[PDB]
């Protein structure tokens, strides 16, 4: 049988390719590792004829450097030029770039009328992450890059962090060629993982040679895997996105809450425990979780058993292992793979969450600052237990608990349980039409980056 | 199961190094994305042409109701999440029949789809496109909210009045439309479809048979496409 | 269950690489 294998290092394979390949050591094309390049032209207030001319000339220089894809084959950079203001509009689509010449003609002739509305740069990020980058070419080493241009300094608001998290979740590495330095934005980008964005400063008039060098070599052209050490990244942007290395003393505390035999067929249960085991494998458990003050701990909890309705003397949940119950990653992984078993009971979601947070998190010694509660729901949640559950969630959100919801199957309603996940629900709430989807890259990457979004 | 397989190295090499010939090994295109509750307004456009027929209209009705059911519809006109659905049927007269505007009123859409009546008359694709643009997007009520992307679904066999095709395509392009046409038949002009698709042939779904709308695989793929 | 292999290693990866890019310079 087996769950699955371990992927080899992406950079090692790429290097082994580009030295035994009579198709790579020729000309030095800029958009290596094909990319979808989104250009969010700033058509907001404070942008006049001259400013738009300069911005379009910067875009023209960049696209002149690139090599636009002209076939079904997955290579070259495909350019989508949108213009963003209080609203967002699309001028060039990814599939519209059939040839480089016609794309350049469209960009040069692009004369979108200047607007007189505020700069909703966060709306631009959300739209680019969700809509523009929805349908993109299949590829594991494909890159998603958006070059946002900003002239009016941003403001420190929660929606900015929400949009940054959405960008990170969608797999898109932003790049803000700001005209002026705004501390609020660069602080907002400072949620650092292997897909963290950056903000530059757009100079005046000429002197764009070194500026283009900086904005191309470190961000668009290669940006990865031999990243031109004189970039400042510090090897902080490889493929196969993960969180920061062990050097980051991340004080995470994750508790998973599963479902009973009610709509958790052994197939779905196997998939959920596989996902949990993979998530643990990609974390940093404390060597001694009982007495250590730093590092991480995990717990997995199942929904209520059958003999929990007439009374509440027994735990409303089958606590499979508390936070400080396993001190070694291998032991926990083996327990999840082999020792786990269903229990054939009812759900009672709100009571389960309350008991788990009141007798698994708090009971453990030295609680971590940031703690996460994952709910893996695979069945209908009766409305009578909806409200109470949400009420409990509110309390858990007051004590600092970030929530991840994974609705599995079609039976689970999504209209009501969407709000359970912490804000923004787009990234924290996840949908899977099948259990198998839990073990696919779009969700494994989200799980890996989960410590970053919290 | 290996972490990467023959197809994974296939695409690795085809991506990092280059291509030749283009030969297409394996099948991995347009990864799309498992849909969140992002706001999407889906407009369905049905063929009133004599060729479509009666039981074909019934199968298309079943498909439309099924997709409207499966998707997580919205709850108000200005909803920022979920999705909305509308149906249009272009026939003879310029004032095409509005089966229902963009609605989340699931009972309303079900009863309307039950009460919508086949036209069975000549029609024009461009006429239907312009009528939909001027009767849903430009409609005073139930118009596509700006933050919600618009997706035009074309239940057209392809053989239909072409009058105002390039003009209709330009009008759709202006309104930031993302058409996804369905070709239900074997005698479909690929070129009018390409014009309808606004450039991309991955936005046109070719069907082996009229009842292909009911197959679970096609339903799932299309649902992921629009949502 | 067992952790699946690392995929095409050595023989397989080299075979594929010399199979695709056998038509360029
Ligand atoms: C990367 O970020 C960490 C932590 O920063 C916080 O958490 C992030 C996920 C993000 O949300 C930030 O906005 C938060 O501020 C930084 O680690 C801290 O570093 C400072 C000094 O640099 C130190 O005093 C703190 O104790 C650290 N906290 C930890 C390790 O938990 C780290 O410096 C950032 N890396 C950079 C800026 O290169
Ligand atoms: C629209 O639906 C309502 C009831 O459905 C609920 O409300 C909707 C807004 C939507 O959220 C659905 O998912 C909900 O399940 C239908 O009910 C009508 O209600 C009115 C008074 O409110 C009553 O006079 C009618 O007789 C009801 N008709 C039926 C068939 O129940 C309503 O009819 C639907 N709209 C239309 C145009 O039929
Ligand atoms: C039910 O719970 C009560 C108290 O909650 C306890 O006294 C009783 O023994 C329980 N019955 C069982 C476990 O069968
Ligand atoms: C254009 O559309 C009209 C509408 O009926 C149709 O008769 C005609 O065949 C189409 N083709 C051309 C070239 O006009």
Residue numbers in the entry:
A (entry chain C): 2367 to 2820
B (entry chain B): 586 to 606, 814 to 1019
C (entry chain A): 584 to 608
Task: Quote the study's own text.
Collagen VI links the cell surface to the extracellular matrix to provide mechanical strength to most mammalian tissues, and is linked to human diseases including muscular dystrophy, fibrosis, cardiovascular disease and osteoarthritis. Collagen VI assembles from heterotrimers of three different α-chains into microfibrils, but there are many gaps in our knowledge of the molecular assembly process. All collagen VI chains have a short collagenous region flanked by globular N and C-termini, which are mainly composed of domains homologous to the A-domains of Von Willebrand factor (vWA)2. Collagen VI assembles in a hierarchical manner where three collagen VI α-chains associate to form heterotrimers.
Therefore, to understand how collagen VI monomers assemble, an expression system was designed to generate mini-collagen VI heterotrimers with the C-terminal domains of the α1, α2 and α3 chains and a short stretch of collagenous sequence with nine Gly-X-Y triplets. Processing of the cryoEM data revealed that there was substantial flexibility between the vWA domains, presumably due to the interdomain linkers, but a core of three vWA domains could be resolved, with additional diffuse areas of density, likely to be the other three vWA domains, seen in the 2D classes. Local refinements of the most structurally homogenous region yielded a 3.14 Å resolution structure, with additional diffuse areas of density for the other three vWA domains seen at higher thresholds. The three vWA domains, which were resolved to high resolution, were the α3 C1 and C2 domains and the α2 C2 domain, where the α3 C2 domain is adjacent to the α3 C1 domain. The trimeric coiled coil has hydrophobic amino acids involved in stabilising the internal surface. The coiled coil is stabilised by two interchain disulphide bonds between α3 and α2, and α2 and α1 chains. The α3 C1 domain packs closely against the coiled coil, with Tyr597 from the α2 chain coiled coil contributing to a hydrophobic pocket with residues Ile2380, Phe2399 and Phe2506, which likely stabilises the interface. The opposite side of the α3 C1 domain interacts with the α2 C2 domain, where salt bridges are formed between residues Asp2462 and Arg965 and Arg 2501 and Glu941. The mini-collagen VI structure shows how this occurs for collagen VI, as there is a short region of the collagenous triple-helical domain visible in the structure emerging from the coiled coil region. The interchain hydrogen bonds and stagger suggest that the α3 chain is trailing, the α2 chain is the middle and the α1 chain is leading, going from a C- to N-terminal direction using the convention defined in ref.
